[PDB]
Design a protein around this ligand. Structure first.
Ligand SMILES: CC(=N)N1CCC(Oc2ccc([C@H](Cc3ccc4ccc(C(=N)N)cc4c3)C(=O)O)cc2)CC1
Ligand SMILES: [Ca+2]
Length: 223
């Protein structure tokens, strides 16, 4: 997260860290046994780490659970990043409490202007690389479809939305991928892509979760 702030230990209880010997992607806990992330985060040998703040020190409250199966959306396209969504089933159900809790799926899509909270352990620099120990947060509004498509001509599908600041300086970045975009207590987006990080007129692009609620529910029910 570039231009964000330190969230505070366990203040984003649904935030998950995907680990394979190091943090590589974020995710959101949607129930005791399922996590939603980005399809481009797919990898074998994924350990889901819940209740994390400092990802390098064991501070208490952490729950490490192996992924039993990762389900990449069947229509995911790796070049366009359309349908960039993946469901991860935990080997065992997580112990939900004050510091580890699930986030609700939306019943309707969010409108332009809606303020949302984006979080992650991704790169904190626009020019260069600097990864944080603790979780970073950023409040950003959903932009209009017009501005989104003007920024990324011919690259925005109906399953994507832009969020952020056109003036640059505040944005999600590499490492934040798969993480949550929560608006009014509902998971509306998943960190997907963008051109660089926190660049002028190049806001972040996110997977539009409201378009996948039926798919998520049907898939979870059959697995
Ligand atoms: C051709 C086309 N339709 N598109 C859309 C999808 C695709 O977008 C992508 C896909 C991957 C990449 C990465 C780097 C990367 C990875 C994760 C990111 C997450 C968030 C942000 C952001 N600025 N909000 C930027 C990121 C930039 C890389 O360089 O490895 C960058 C753009 C290419 C451009
Ligand atoms: Ca740690």
């Amino acid at each position: 997260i570039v231009g964000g702030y330190t969230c505070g230990a366990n203040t984003v209880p649904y935030q998950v860290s995907l680990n394979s010997g190091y943090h590589f992607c974020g995710g959101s806990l949607i129930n005791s046994q399922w996590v939603v992330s980005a399809a481009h985060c797919y990898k074998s040998g994924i350990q889901v780490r819940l209740g994390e703040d400092n990802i390098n020190v064991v501070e208490g409250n952490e729950q490490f659970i192996s992924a039993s199966k990762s389900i990449v959306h069947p229509s995911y396209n790796s070049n366009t990043l359309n349908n960039d969504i993946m469901l991860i089933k935990l080997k065992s159900a997580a112990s939900l409490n004050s510091r580890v809790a699930s986030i609700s799926l939306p019943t309707s899509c969010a409108s332009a202007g809606t303020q949302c909270l984006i979080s992650g352990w991704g790169n904190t620099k626009s020019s260069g690389t600097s990864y944080p120990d603790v979780l970073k947060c950023l409040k950003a509004p959903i932009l209009s479809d017009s501005s989104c498509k003007s920024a990324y001509p011919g690259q925005i599908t109906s399953n994507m939305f832009c969020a952020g600041y056109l003036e640059g300086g505040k944005d999600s970045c590499q490492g934040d991928s798969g993480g949550p975009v929560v608006c009014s207590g509902k998971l509306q987006g998943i960190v997907s892509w963008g051109s660089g990080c926190a660049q002028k007129n190049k806001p972040g692009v996110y997977t539009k979760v409201c378009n996948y609620v039926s798919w998520i529910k049907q898939t979870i029910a059959s697995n």
